[PDB]
Amino acid sequence: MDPSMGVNSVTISVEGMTCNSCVWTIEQQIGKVNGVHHIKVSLEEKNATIIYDPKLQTPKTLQEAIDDMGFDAVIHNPD
């Protein structure tokens, strides 16, 4: 019904985080950063893609939440 009635998705390329602590620290950070209806990070697939509310948030906080955690982030969705 509402997989994303009023939200958007963003995929961030990541690197240098091939250790559990990067998926539980980026999933816990992005997942609870603001409104992440679904967050998918993968220390081995080297990417972090999630969904967020573009009405109150945007891919700048997802880039600030990945930049805040400490992992090379190269989002390839809007740009």
Ligand SMILES: [Cu+]
């Ligand atoms: Cu780690």
